[PDB]
Write a protein that binds this ligand. Structure first.
Ligand SMILES: [Ca+2]
Ligand SMILES: [Ca+2]
Ligand SMILES: [Ca+2]
Ligand SMILES: [Ca+2]
Length: 402
């Protein structure tokens, strides 16, 4: 009957499981740490900008926040911000523009274990943004207006390029263009520097390294002026390639509609079930170990804890079905690097011969769950065997994992 409508099914499951472990092994949030010397905080993270004709552009950020004021501030223990960005266009806007929607929430400190400034953020606060830029001598300016609602960690902003054509891609300016609007949970309110610095505010400084291209250097004043929260930025860009991804405008805007098909949910539910061995709706360290062990890895308890904590929204110490859904949705929106895809291929290519033998694919899926037979196995191979060789190579593998 159909080997094909259930080998395509069996493929996704294992593809998703391998991509999910790749994710739990990555550091994708905004890592915050105290900076006693500057009476402030440091941050590091990376941004993925999908390249227009396939590929991903990485942007490594190093951040520094210092209060403008003499007054006391909250110095956090290490935690992270978890961000969802949505970029759109206003259908009635003739000028070069960007509509930004962001949901930001603090996490990273488990349940197993406030400020004067917070007062100013209980309602909806109007925001004003102003940037002067210079990238490789190409100047530009951006003006922004919108609103913040820290109760939900929601931000909404509309930007106009006041100088005409923006010489860099809009996505590259998202992080530059108000972390005081994050939602800190009740258990973590004492770790919120941003709000604690208000109304006098902070200086935000960053260096952003676009891999294989130039960098930005930003300096920003984030403070209240009346009952408006204001962000005034200066950006300087050097060492860009004229033909490159940034100056050459080769980055995607914002593709994939923010919401998932009842079909994609089901696709991810199949994957989720590979880990949720006991069908309780949540993935424990024990469960993650089993999966990893059966993929050849051998992690410590500490590692397992860390992995979970990358995506553990509620701090319970486990990955619940919703948290899994968020994680997978995000992993689907942003492209993986060469190295990441290489790692994924190595799960399968046990001998390291550069070739996924039908033999090796059977081994994998055995150890994982499935009761696949040498007939279904064969059918999978055939589906993305571009060069008819009877084995899957790197290039082949890249297409099979989309
Ligand atoms: Ca479970
Ligand atoms: Ca959880
Ligand atoms: Ca092999
Ligand atoms: Ca082949």
């Amino acid at each position: 009957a159909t080997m094909v409508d259930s080998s395509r099914r069996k493929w996704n499951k294992t593809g998703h499981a391998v991509r999910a472990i790749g994710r739990l092994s990555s550091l994708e949030n905004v890592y915050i740490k105290a900076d006693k010397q500057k009476n402030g905080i440091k941050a590091n993270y990376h941004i993925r900008h999908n390249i227009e004709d396939g590929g991903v552009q990485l942007a490594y950020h190093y951040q520094q926040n210092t209060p403008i004021g003499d007054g006391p501030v909250l110095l956090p223990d290490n935690h992270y911000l978890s961000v969802q960005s949505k970029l759109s266009k206003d259908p009635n806007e003739k000028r070069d523009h960007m509509v930004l929607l962001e949901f930001v929430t603090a996490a990273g400190i488990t349940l197993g274990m406030v400020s004067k400034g917070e007062e100013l953020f209980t309602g909806v606060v109007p925001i004003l943004v102003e940037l002067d830029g210079d990238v490789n001598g190409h100047k530009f300016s951006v003006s922004g207006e919108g609103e913040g609602d820290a109760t939900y960690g929601k931000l909404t902003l509309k930007f106009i390029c006041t100088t005409g054509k923006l010489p860099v891609p809009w996505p590259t300016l998202v992080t530059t263009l108000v972390q005081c609007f994050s939602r800190y949970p009740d258990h973590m309110k004492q770790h919120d520097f941003f709000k604690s610095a208000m109304p006098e505010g902070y200086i935000q400084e960053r260096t952003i390294f676009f891999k294989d291209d130039g960098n930005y250097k930003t300096r920003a004043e984030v403070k209240f002026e009346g009952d408006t929260l204001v962000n005034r930025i200066e950006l300087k860009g050097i060492d860009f390639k004229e033909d490159g991804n940034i100056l050459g405008h080769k980055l995607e805007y914002n593709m994939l509609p923010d919401q998932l098909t009842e079909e994609q949910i089901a696709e991810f539910k199949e994957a989720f079930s590979l880990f949720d061995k006991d069908g309780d709706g949540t993935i424990t360290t024990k469960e993650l170990g089993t999966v990893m062990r059966s993929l050849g890895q051998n992690p410590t308890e500490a590692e397992l804890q860390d992995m979970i904590n990358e995506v553990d929204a509620d701090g319970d110490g486990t990955i619940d079905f919703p948290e899994f859904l968020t994680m997978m949705a995000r992993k689907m929106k942003y492209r993986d690097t060469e190295e990441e895809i290489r790692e994924a291929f190595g799960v399968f290519d046990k001998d390291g011969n550069g070739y996924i033998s039908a033999a090796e694919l059977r081994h994998v899926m055995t150890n994982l769950g499935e009761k696949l037979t040498d007939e279904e196995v064969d059918e999978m191979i055939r589906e993305a065997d571009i060069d008819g060789d009877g084995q899957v190579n790197y290039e082949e593998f890249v297409q099979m994992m989309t």
